[PDB]
Each structure stands twice: as structure tokens, then as C-alpha cells.
Design a protein around this ligand. Structure first.
Ligand code: FES
Ligand code: FES
Lengths: 65, 65
């Protein structure tokens, strides 16, 4: 069973590379591949966890202050 | 129907990782397939997942400019 079901299925390996300056003060990244704002988290993991019984959540990268 | 995460910290109801940009050093490669033995970091387990399921998931790279 696949993890990603709809994102850029013409791409054989979806990879996102960012410079830390592109994150600003905080970036919240999607790790469930259900977000409408992918690679960013939009809270779609909540609906996925409720329907499948999963426990996935996002990745948060922020500035120290 | 089926879950994304199968074995990582199943006692945790929502797996979230939060880092300061200083904790990344020069480059961090984050897992988005939940198959890595070094989770939240990518160990290349996505290649085996993509080969077996026909998926196209890949990691998230955050680096210094
Ligand atoms: S929407 Fe995918 S982890 Fe939040
Ligand atoms: S091991 Fe999960 S994306 Fe590389």
C-alpha cells in the first residue's frame, strides 16, 4: 500500500529542498501527503488519523527566538 | 482505510517533531515515508518502499545557503 495517493504522480520520487532562509520564522511540513498546501502542513493529518487510526504529525522547523 | 506509519512510536497519539534551525547544522534530510530506522531523519528506506508499493515519496532537505 502507497503512502502518497494524489501528489505529482508523474514524478518517480518527490523531494523538496529548501534553504533555511526560505522558512522565515517557522515552517510546518506535512509528513502525511494529505495536505492541500504540500509540502506544508494544513492540518489534514487530523482527518487521516481519525479515519485510519494512524498517529502521524507534521515536522516543525523554527528560529530559536 | 490503511495507515501511513506502521511501527514508529505507536504509543504516541500524534508524532510531531519540532527543531530549531541551529539543531540542523549545515543540512538535515527528513523522512516523509515513516520507514526510516533513524526517524525523523531519512536513511534511504523510501527507495525500498517506492520499489515495493509503486509509490513516489521522498525526503525533505533543509540546508544552509
Ligand atoms: S497535513 Fe500532513 S502532517 Fe499536517
Ligand atoms: S527514509 Fe523516509 S523519506 Fe527517506
Amino acid at each position: 500500500a502507497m503512502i502518497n495517493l494524489h501528489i505529482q504522480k508523474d514524478n518517480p520520487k518527490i523531494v523538496h529542498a529548501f534553504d533555511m532562509e526560505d522558512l522565515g520564522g517557522k515552517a510546518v511540513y506535512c509528513r502525511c501527503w494529505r495536505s492541500k498546501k504540500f509540502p506544508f502542513c494544513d492540518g489534514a493529518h487530523t482527518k487521516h488519523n481519525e479515519e485510519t487510526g494512524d498517529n502521524v504529525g507534521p515536522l516543525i522547523i523554527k528560529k530559536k527566538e
